[PDB]
Amino acid sequence: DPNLWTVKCKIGEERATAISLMRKFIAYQFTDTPLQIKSVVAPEHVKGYIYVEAYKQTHVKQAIEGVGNLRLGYWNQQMVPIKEMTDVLKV
Amino acid sequence: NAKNVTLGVPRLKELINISKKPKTPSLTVFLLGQSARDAERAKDILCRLEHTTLRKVTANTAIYYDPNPQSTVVAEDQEWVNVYYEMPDFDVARISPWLLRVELDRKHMTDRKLTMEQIAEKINAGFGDDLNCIFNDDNAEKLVLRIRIMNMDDDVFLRCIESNMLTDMTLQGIEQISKVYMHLPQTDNKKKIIITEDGEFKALQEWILETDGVSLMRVLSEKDVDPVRTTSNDIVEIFTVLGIEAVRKALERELYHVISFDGSYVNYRHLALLCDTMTCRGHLMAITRHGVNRQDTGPLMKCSFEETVDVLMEAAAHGESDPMKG
Amino acid sequence: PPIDLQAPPRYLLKFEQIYLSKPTHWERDGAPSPMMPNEARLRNLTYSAPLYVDITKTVIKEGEEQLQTQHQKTFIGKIPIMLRSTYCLLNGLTDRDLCELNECPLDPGGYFIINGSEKVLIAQEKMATNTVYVFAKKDSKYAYTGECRSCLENSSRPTSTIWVSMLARGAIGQRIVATLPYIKQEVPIIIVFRALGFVSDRDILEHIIYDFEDPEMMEMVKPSLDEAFVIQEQNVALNFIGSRGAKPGVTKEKRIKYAKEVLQKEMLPHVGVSDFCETKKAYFLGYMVHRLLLAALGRRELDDRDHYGNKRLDLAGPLLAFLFRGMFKNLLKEVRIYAQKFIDRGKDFNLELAIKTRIISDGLKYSLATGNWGDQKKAHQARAGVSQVLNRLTFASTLSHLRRLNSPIGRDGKLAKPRQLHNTLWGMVCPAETPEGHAVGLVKNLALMAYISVGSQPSPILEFLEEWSMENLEEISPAAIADATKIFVNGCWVGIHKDPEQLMNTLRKLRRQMDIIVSEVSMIRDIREREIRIYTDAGRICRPLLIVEKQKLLLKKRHIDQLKEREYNNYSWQDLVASGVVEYIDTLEEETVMLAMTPDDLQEKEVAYCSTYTHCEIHPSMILGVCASIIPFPDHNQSPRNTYQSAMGKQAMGVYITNFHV
Amino acid sequence: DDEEETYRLWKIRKTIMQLCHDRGYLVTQDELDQTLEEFKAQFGDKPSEGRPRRTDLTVLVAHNDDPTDQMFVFFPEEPKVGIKTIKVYCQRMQEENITRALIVVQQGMTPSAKQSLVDMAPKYILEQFLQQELLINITEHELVPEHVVMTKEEVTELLARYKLRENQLPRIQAGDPVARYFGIKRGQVVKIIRPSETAGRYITYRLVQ
Amino acid sequence: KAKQDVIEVIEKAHNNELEPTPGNTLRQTFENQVNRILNDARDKTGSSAQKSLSEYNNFKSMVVSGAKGSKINISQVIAVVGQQNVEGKRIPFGFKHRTLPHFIKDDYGPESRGFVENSYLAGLTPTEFFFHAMGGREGLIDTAVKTAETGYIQRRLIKSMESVMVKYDATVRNSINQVVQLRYGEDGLAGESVEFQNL
Amino acid sequence: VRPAVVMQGSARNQDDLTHKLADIVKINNQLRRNEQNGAAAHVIAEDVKLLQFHVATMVDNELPGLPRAMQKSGRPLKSLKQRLKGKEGRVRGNLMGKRV
Amino acid sequence: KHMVDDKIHSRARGPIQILNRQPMEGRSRDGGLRFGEMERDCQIAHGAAQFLRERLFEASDP
Amino acid sequence: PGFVGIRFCQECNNMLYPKEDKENRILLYACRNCDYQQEADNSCIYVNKITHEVDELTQIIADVSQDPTLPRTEDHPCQKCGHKEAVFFQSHSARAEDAMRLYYVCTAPHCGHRWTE
DNA sequence: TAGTATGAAAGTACTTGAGCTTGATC
DNA sequence: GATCAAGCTCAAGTACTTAAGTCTGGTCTATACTA
Ligand SMILES: [Zn+2]
Ligand SMILES: [Zn+2]
């Protein structure tokens, strides 16, 4: 299964960043540079960073090289613990 | 701020905070008999103490591929090699064609009055029979010893063994002692004060040696060396070889020497109180956090000096009690 | 660089020209009015002038539907102005006009006014850049270390310091390594050479050893070759380098990319920033290793860290440039984010609201007000002590403060080496004027005739050398470097030459005639080592000296005659320098210069001491500073006393300035 | 190679005799100051061949106060002594109903052997010494004052006189060269008499730890 | 004469006619000989100045009573200041094999290495003034650096021995009641009333 | 131990310890509500990790590797240890040697 | 500029700090002089326990 | 003896490493990358000069005579051309204790003969 | 708007991996 | 006689502290967010 990577986003604009990145995926999925990531998680109570479901940090970087909101996390990304998928989606 | 000696605050410092690596550690070697009067035997003792590696007496080394020792590559080494190879002395079948020709110098060799024989025995002892060594007579204009390995590759191992022997191999002397200085003391604090048959004090002017290293256990165990007056400035070696009362006295002598070098004077009761406080626990109680905060003086007395928070942490975790004595 | 941002539509926002008006002040009503320094000192204002820059924004969306828009004289920010400078309102004013403005005609200026406080920038010393210096640390894993703080002509990033060290003896021999920037692990020099496209060991050595007939150097470099021989191509060399860094890419592709850009941008930026990395950097790195080999064999002397020739004085120019560059970057950043959040909504934006003019203004104001050299947030990583309050206790103190130097070694340091009065302080710094507290030797004071270079472009010199018989570095063959003499310019190895005698004689003739080469240019011809180092950089402390012919001075009586009637025939110091009679000599050139204290030394004596003088001192008393020049008969007192007086002259009462009632 | 070995053996024997004499063991004056010539005539000058062998140098002395309180001194031939040699000497002592012994090693001693010197302490009080530190008698040095091991009666009187406890006196490490020379263990008090430039003679007392 | 002897020593070493002394390098031997010649000249000139002072001279009146100064100061004010030393050695070659650009390369002579042949009254030459400034600066640096190390030493010594005192039983004990000395100074006497004597 | 002195105006300024205790009570309350109602476990550990960093930096700010507890004016709040670590502290600056 | 009128200082039951109820620092605040550690060491040598107590406890912050 | 210079291959021009041919018992130099081999002509593979018996006359260069900071003398003329004036300087090279030795160079162009007294 | 909120330190003591003795086994 | 494993010894690191005394004067000290 794909792994979750934590990418830092502007505080309070994680939802906007997710909407923008999914719109860009819609616009560029049929192009020569589609987004190989699977999904994105922006928990309601998690501010400052979001989770990207991808197999490689390379895929994560190619997905987040869009809006500048994720520039700070563009330099490096951090794995989400294997046990942590269950906790990711808890409300 | 003969040889360079540390004085003033740096030396006072190294004494109060016992240092395992002083800046100018040295010995004060005193001779026993005729060597104390003449200079030739004294030189023999000096050479018997001063550490001598093969690099000090070697002029140049060279590695050759000599396939058959009968007809060597070099032309000047063909006379004594056949004089040594005419008879089977070693396992000629277990021989390697890679030669290590070392050339020494008559000057440094004659000063230390060594002989190629002794060098050969040192090589055959340090490397056993695995490394065969031969040499010519002490008559040629150039000293050379031809070396071979007995059986990484051979050439690389030779270049590695070349440096092994060029440094660690101690021909003569005692290691950790780089140089030794011989001189006649003009001051009476280093002369030999005897009591004549009439009962008057006479200060004999005798030769003494000053080393750049410190190895008391080995220097004291040598012939013609005085095992009573020979001392050192490295209080660590004194405590490790002679003990706590000896380091107590040696420490007082070093402090007195540091304070009196500039002509000043301090009452002995103060130097004694310091030297006793630094030795009243059997070990060298350094004047630092590592020596003062390690005794049972109480957490408040230690926190006021150094490691204020850490000491109180250990005291709390251990339930220590300050008896309010200091 | 033009900031290209896109959601689609894109905008570049490219700048072209700037315009800096005179100092002005805007009241609440907004009426622009000129502000005089006295008004700033009284109203606690900041004597600053506005900066106007021209901007051009072109819209590019699709179908080549382009249109350009120009914003002429855009107010980007305010800049504090140095009193009595060209842009200061007190420029060219007569003593009477200055009196009308309630200003002292004797005030030398050279200071700023921030919130009514007279702030002065203290010249900060720093190790010279683009130069190779081979040192030797007593306690370290390396025996000899050859470092070179490299930075491009137009500094844009911090100094990328590269080290080329040699491992101490005790695998088989002594190994040479290289501590590259952005890499936390040593790298053998051969790998770096292979990463630049030189795989053959012969070509690598040809760049390192210029005379193959010297087997001593070849045996000394042999361990490094035998240590790195499995790698024989550029791809792996780059991959290995990328693996040693702190960002090891899981894929070898980005590793190679990271190493390529590091070796192309961070490693030796003054030696190149593109293909140059092999066209010159390999050659330079070769010379960098060559210096290390010469140092290990004793064929050359180690460099002294406390030598003025090897140091530079950071004045207000190079200091404020560092601030303006860092803040301009922060401004372009804030303009990026501002326009970014607008174009994402699919609409245009007005740059007038995007330019946060408060950035440059409050930044320069804060830096010159508090002294913390850096951003307002980094109040701990920045170095304080710069921009001190001008001492107005006496005119001697004021002059001394404006001519003060400072070494950033840190007052906490107890090493006497950097605090000692080095032999190179002759004529450039006052040997007596220095504090007696915890800053002895660190805080110094310039000599009376000391002049710190301002800077110049090396382009005209390079054009003259290329036009001359000099041969470039890429056109020559390594076999010609043996007998030829090297030629460096601001530390950049440019080429080689054959007859350097007539070369020097020509360059000197040009500098003495105020030709293409200006007087501040230094030309040092090391003779034993065939290097010829030319310098045009700023911060090079120098002083004037009288040129000397075969055995006589060039300052004839006709000059003194014209100088006596200086108010009538307008014959000043510039005309004296242009006549080729005086020359500005720096500390690095003094090593190759043979001075004469007085003309008496040039006469024929019963025993000839030198008989081949080339320069002469104007007057030996000029080696003293300001607070030491006031001492009568200082050559008759114990030196500490002259130092204590130099420290008391600044504390003595008097009339610190004529306009003290205002 | 050989004359030095016999010289070392002689010097070590002289130092051992001085040591045992200082511990209070019965040692004749002749062997106390034995010249090198007397040693060569009584033992030999050929240690490389085996004459004398280090096994011959074994000493056995008896205390002046108690004749049955004897003490051994062994000189192993192996440079690095192993546990087997200690087992040999321990059994030797068991056979000869002796409790105290000295092992003069050449190069050093293995860790397991040192532990064996610590576990059999209440049964056999046996110590170890390096020949390199035995070639000189440290008590003749000018820095080393005159030490004297006090008896339990003398210590009780000392503590009762100054009215202090044992933990209040200055300390001396049991591993100290002088402490090893006099063979003192924890709880014992050693009296040191040293010359003083302020009073002439100063007597101090150190507790072993 | 001193400068002529130094010139002769330089000619000997330059012609290899000078041999090193036991335990010292050739360079060290040369510098020791030069330093010896200069020190002898300074002492001889100083004695000559001291012999020339009259009983009414005030400098002599200061040195005799010891109120302030010494014979060395008089020698420096009247006859010759002497050699200027940096780190116990002569003025080093700050430049490339030179002390200052006014001297030739490889000039180990007295004036080039910092011999101040003039007195403070006659006035120092420019080079001698710069070298004297070096000799002075080393004193200021030492006076400004030793304060931290010595003060830290004074603190360490106090904190280690601040509770050690002479109890009522005449013995010296610390805060832990441990005994450091059975009698203060091994004799139980205070250091004020004692004084030097002769046996 | 943490006196809130009034400036030239009515404005009241808090001590470094008060500013730190505020952060501790903030993260503590967050942890309490995050455990009272079902919340993501990693989240809990997260606030905990941060709580550990706050409590540590209140008593010891000079932790190697970790970021300094910078608060107002982006400056690290003085840690209780720094108040009594050495010179100018409590023991040496207010107990052993003090104003008189 | 180092005159005596700008250096003369005296204090007797003046203002005190807020954190610790000890005298202020500086002439501008009518502060007290610092009875540093070196002074404590000196009075310890004199054996003056009452003076050392009055200075560190009764005259500073009882 | 003298030091030994490096031999470069003809294929990749890289340096060869000392190797021996076991069948004929002869010294060979082969490249560790390609399959090139060469017959050695010196038979010596390593030379270390502990004494540092270096003749400084090869390290000095005639262009040094153009240095105005160097002292000149007329008492030691040149043996190759007879010029009277000549510059003199010390060894100044590390690893050489007898550094007080003077090295002379002729100031005449097209000669610059060097020697030692 | 009106207000909340975001390049010139050195020392000791302790932990870790490498090499080696004695054991338990074979 | 042989072996591998346990574990003791040694040289390589890391974690942590400390760096003279007192005294005076002077300047300077946040603004992003987003409603
Ligand atoms: Zn090849
Ligand atoms: Zn000639």
CB contact at 8 A, A77 and A61: yes
Our CA angle for B25, B26, B31, nearest 5°, is 165
Among C11, C10, C21, C5, residue whose Cα is nearest residue C56: C11
Sheet (strand C311-314) strand order: C311-314, C123-127, C405-406
Hey, which chains touch A, using 3+ CB pairs under 8 Å?
Answer: C, F
Can you tell me the distance from the alpha carbon of C145 to that of C168, in angstroms, rounded to the nearest whole number? 11
CB contact at 8 A, E141 and C440: yes
**C-alpha separations of C15 from B74, C56, C69, C327, C581 in Å:** 77, 6, 12, 15, 45
**C-alpha separations of C579 from C452, C511, C519, C627 in Å:** 22, 11, 12, 33
Can you tell me the distance from the alpha carbon of B12 to that of B18, in angstroms, rounded to the nearest whole number? 10
Contact across the interface for E23 and B181, Cβ inside 8 Å: yes
Tokens found for residue E57: 């001279």
Compare all CA atoms of chain F with the CA of A47 and give the residue at the minimum distance.
Answer: F43
3-class secondary structure, B59: strand
Tokens found for residue C545: 């000296």
Contact across the interface for B160 and C170, Cβ inside 8 Å: no
Which domains occur in chain D, in start order?
1-136 (3.40.1340.10), 137-209 (3.90.940.20)
Can you tell me the distance from the alpha carbon of C411 to that of C409, in angstroms, rounded to the nearest whole number? 7
Phi and psi at residue C135, to the nearest 5°: -110, 175
**AA letter at G2:** H
Phi and psi at residue E11, to the nearest 5°: -65, -40
Query: In C456-491, where do the E strands start and end?
Result: 471-472, 485-489
What's the number of CA atoms in the CB half-sphere (13 Å) around residue C406?
Answer: 20
**G16-27: buried (b, 16+ CB within 10 Å) or exposed (e) per residue?**
bbeeeebbbeee
Residues in E touching D204 (Cβ below 8 Å): 181-182
Contact across the interface for E162 and G37, Cβ inside 8 Å: no
Can you tell me the distance from the alpha carbon of C541 to that of C590, in angstroms, rounded to the nearest whole number? 11
Residues in H touching B58 (Cβ below 8 Å): 50
Among C433, C487, C426, C491, residue whose Cα is nearest residue C623: C426
Q: Which residues form the domain of C233?
A: 131-312
Residues in G touching C652 (Cβ below 8 Å): 1
Can you tell me the distance from the alpha carbon of C53 to that of E174, in angstroms, rounded to the nearest whole number? 77
Between β-strands C311-314 and C123-127, what pairing exists: parallel, antiparallel or unpaired?
A: antiparallel
Taking only residues 97 to 136 of chain E, the set having a beta carbon closer than 8 angstroms to any beta carbon of chain H reads: 97-98, 101, 104-107
**B176-189: buried (b, 16+ CB within 10 Å) or exposed (e) per residue?**
ebeebbbeebeeee
Tokens found for residue C251: 């894929």
Q: What is the CA C149 to C1' I7 distance in angstroms? A: 10
Phi and psi at residue B308, to the nearest 5°: -60, -45
Preceding omega of D52 cis (within 30 degrees of 0): yes
Domain chopping of chain H, boundaries: 4-48, 49-117
Among E160, D206, D176, residue whose Cα is nearest residue B291: E160
Q: What is the CA D114 to C1' J7 distance in angstroms? A: 15
Can you tell me the distance from the alpha carbon of B60 to that of H52, in angstroms, rounded to the nearest whole number? 9
Among E149, E155, E146, residue whose Cα is nearest residue G38: E155
Q: What is the CA F70 to C1' I2 distance in angstroms? A: 29
Angle between helices F16-36 and F41-59 (to 10 degrees): 160
Residue C477: is it exposed, middle or buried by C-beta count within 10 angstroms (0-12/13-18/19+)? exposed
Question: Does A41 contact C at CB distance below 8 Å?
Answer: no
Tokens found for residue E146: 């030793």
DSSP, res E89? B
Can you tell me the distance from the alpha carbon of C507 to that of C532, in angstroms, rounded to the nearest whole number? 12
Can you tell me the distance from the alpha carbon of C355 to that of C338, in angstroms, rounded to the nearest whole number? 9
Can you tell me the distance from the alpha carbon of D27 to that of D20, in angstroms, rounded to the nearest whole number? 7
3-class secondary structure, E47: helix
**C-alpha separations of D49 from D54, D76, D80, G47 in Å:** 11, 16, 20, 73
Question: Does F43 contact A at CB distance below 8 Å?
Answer: yes
Phi and psi at residue C549, to the nearest 5°: -80, -160
For chain F, report the end-to-end CA distance as a whole number of angstroms: 21
Residue with tokens 């007329």, as numbered in its chain: H74
Tokens found for residue C50: 């506005």
C310: the nucleotide nearest its CA (via C1') is I7
C149: the nucleotide nearest its CA (via C1') is I7
Phi and psi at residue D90, to the nearest 5°: -65, -45
DSSP, res C346? T
Contact across the interface for G44 and E162, Cβ inside 8 Å: yes
Angle between helices C316-343 and C358-370 (to 10 degrees): 150
Residue with tokens 């102005």, as numbered in its chain: C81
Tokens found for residue C506: 């020509």
Contacts 24+ apart (CB under 8 A), E15-22: E15/H102, E15/H117, E16/H98, E16/H100, E16/H101, E18/H100, E20/H97, E22/B182
CB contact at 8 A, E159 and B292: yes
DSSP, res C424? G
Q: How many CB atoms lie within 10 A of CB H74?
A: 10
- Determination technique for this entry: cryo-EM
Tokens found for residue H59: 């390290």
Can you tell me the distance from the alpha carbon of D197 to that of D203, in angstroms, rounded to the nearest whole number? 13
Touch between B and H (at least 3 CB pairs under 8 Å):
yes
Compare all CA atoms of chain G with the CA of E158 and give the residue at the minimum distance.
Answer: G41
Can you tell me the distance from the alpha carbon of B272 to that of B256, in angstroms, rounded to the nearest whole number? 10
- Ligand 1 center to residue C290 CA distance, Å? 25
Residues in F touching B306 (Cβ below 8 Å): 86
DSSP one-letter string for C605-650 = -SS-S-S---EE-S-GGGGS-HHHHTSSSGGGS-HHHHHHHHHHTT
Can you tell me the distance from the alpha carbon of C224 to that of B300, in angstroms, rounded to the nearest whole number? 58
Ligand nearest to the CA of H9: 1
**AA letter at B92:** V
| Option in G19, G32, G37 nearest F100 (CB) | G32
Can you tell me the distance from the alpha carbon of B224 to that of C601, in angstroms, rounded to the nearest whole number? 63
Among H49, C170, H99, residue whose Cα is nearest residue B55: H49
Number of H helices, E strands in chain C: 20, 27
**C-alpha separations of C67 from A38, C60, C348, G24 in Å:** 40, 8, 13, 69
- Ligand 2 center to residue H116 CA distance, Å? 13
Q: Is H44 annotated as a binding residue?
A: no
Among C331, C364, C338, C341, residue whose Cα is nearest residue C353: C338
Can you tell me the distance from the alpha carbon of F56 to that of D163, in angstroms, rounded to the nearest whole number? 49
D86: the nucleotide nearest its CA (via C1') is I22
Contacts for C32 with CB less than 8 Å, ≥ 6 apart = C24, C25, C26
**AA letter at C442:** L
Phi and psi at residue D196, to the nearest 5°: -130, 130
3-class secondary structure, C582: strand
Our CA angle for B214, B220, B224, nearest 5°, is 125
Can you tell me the distance from the alpha carbon of C352 to that of C350, in angstroms, rounded to the nearest whole number? 6
B308: the nucleotide nearest its CA (via C1') is J17
DSSP, res C121? P
CB contact at 8 A, B20 and B240: no
CB contact at 8 A, D131 and D47: no
SS3 content of chain C, % helix, strand, coil (to 5): 30, 20, 45
Sheet (strand H26-31) strand order: H16-21, H26-31, H37-39
For chain G, report the end-to-end CA distance as a whole number of angstroms: 39
Can you tell me the distance from the alpha carbon of C22 to that of C12, in angstroms, rounded to the nearest whole number? 30
DSSP, res A82? G
Between β-strands B133-135 and B144-147, what pairing exists: parallel, antiparallel or unpaired?
A: antiparallel
C305: the nucleotide nearest its CA (via C1') is I8
CB contact at 8 A, B28 and B212: no
Question: Does A78 contact C at CB distance below 8 Å?
Answer: no
Ligand nearest to the CA of H32: 1
- Ligand 1 center to residue C201 CA distance, Å? 10
CB contact at 8 A, D99 and D68: no
Compare all CA atoms of chain F with the CA of A88 and give the residue at the minimum distance.
Answer: F40
Can you tell me the distance from the alpha carbon of C280 to that of A37, in angstroms, rounded to the nearest whole number? 44
C334: the nucleotide nearest its CA (via C1') is J32
Among B170, B55, B152, B168, residue whose Cα is nearest residue B98: B152
Can you tell me the distance from the alpha carbon of H51 to that of E160, in angstroms, rounded to the nearest whole number? 53
Can you tell me the distance from the alpha carbon of C639 to that of E130, in angstroms, rounded to the nearest whole number? 9
Can you tell me the distance from the alpha carbon of B112 to that of B118, in angstroms, rounded to the nearest whole number? 12
Among D176, C403, C201, residue whose Cα is nearest residue B282: D176
Contact across the interface for E155 and G37, Cβ inside 8 Å: yes
User: Does an H or E element contain D40, and which?
Assistant: helix D36-42
Contacts for C482 with CB less than 8 Å, ≥ 6 apart = C210, C211
**AA letter at E182:** L
Contacts for C84 with CB less than 8 Å, ≥ 6 apart = C90, C91, C107, C108, C109, C110
Tokens found for residue E198: 């002769």
Tokens found for residue C204: 């690598």
H49-117: CATH topology: N-terminal domain of TfIIb (2.20.25)
Q: What is the CA C477 to C1' I2 distance in angstroms? A: 75
Can you tell me the distance from the alpha carbon of D25 to that of C483, in angstroms, rounded to the nearest whole number? 85
- When scoring B289, B303, B309, B310 by the number of chain F Cβ atoms within 10 A, the one with the most, hence best to mutate, is B309
Q: How many CB atoms lie within 10 A of CB C39?
A: 18
Our CA angle for C44, C49, C53, nearest 5°, is 150
Which residues does chain C break after (C to N > 2.5 Å)? 7, 170
Taking only residues 37 to 96 of chain F, the set having a beta carbon closer than 8 angstroms to any beta carbon of chain C reads: 74-75
Q: How many CB atoms lie within 10 A of CB C267?
A: 26
Can you tell me the distance from the alpha carbon of B28 to that of B35, in angstroms, rounded to the nearest whole number? 15
3-class secondary structure, C439: coil
| Option in A20, A57, A58 nearest C344 (CB) | A20
Number of H helices, E strands in chain B: 14, 12
- Ligand 1 center to residue H16 CA distance, Å? 7
Hey, which chains touch D, using 3+ CB pairs under 8 Å?
Answer: B, E
Query: Rounded to 10 degrees, what is the CA torsion of C446, C447, C449, C453?
Result: -30
Tokens found for residue E106: 């490889």
Question: Does E160 contact B at CB distance below 8 Å?
Answer: yes
CATH code: domain of residue C237 = 3.90.1110.10
Task: Give me the count of residues in chain D.
Answer: 209
Q: Is the dihedral of CA C23, C26, C32, C33 positive or negative?
A: negative
Can you tell me the distance from the alpha carbon of C396 to that of C652, in angstroms, rounded to the nearest whole number? 9
Residue with tokens 């008879």, as numbered in its chain: B87
Contact across the interface for F99 and G31, Cβ inside 8 Å: yes
DSSP, res E141? H
Nucleotides of I under 7 A from a protein CB: 6-13, 21-23
Q: How many CB atoms lie within 10 A of CB C169?
A: 10
Query: In C330-444, where do the E strands start and end?
Result: 388-389, 405-406
Can you tell me the distance from the alpha carbon of F92 to that of C418, in angstroms, rounded to the nearest whole number? 33
Hey, which chains touch F, using 3+ CB pairs under 8 Å?
Answer: A, B, C, G
- Ligand 2 center to residue C592 CA distance, Å? 24
Between β-strands C615-616 and B231-232, what pairing exists: parallel, antiparallel or unpaired?
A: unpaired
- Ligand 2 center to residue F54 CA distance, Å? 82
Tokens found for residue E158: 């106090």
Q: What is the CA D196 to C1' J18 distance in angstroms? A: 37
Documented resolution in Å = 3.1
For chain D, report the end-to-end CA distance as a whole number of angstroms: 41
Contact across the interface for H20 and B65, Cβ inside 8 Å: yes
Residues in C touching G2 (Cβ below 8 Å): 651
Can you tell me the distance from the alpha carbon of B207 to that of B38, in angstroms, rounded to the nearest whole number? 8
Taking only residues 325 to 344 of chain C, the set having a beta carbon closer than 8 angstroms to any beta carbon of chain A reads: 336-337, 340, 344
DSSP, res C265? I
**C-alpha separations of C306 from B309, C125, C303, C417, C418 in Å:** 41, 11, 9, 8, 6
Our CA angle for D149, D153, D156, nearest 5°, is 100
DSSP, res D138? G
Task: Give me the count of residues in chain F.
Answer: 100
Touch between H and D (at least 3 CB pairs under 8 Å):
no
CB contact at 8 A, C285 and C206: no
Show the DSSP H helices in E161-186 as ranges.
none
Tokens found for residue C519: 């007087």
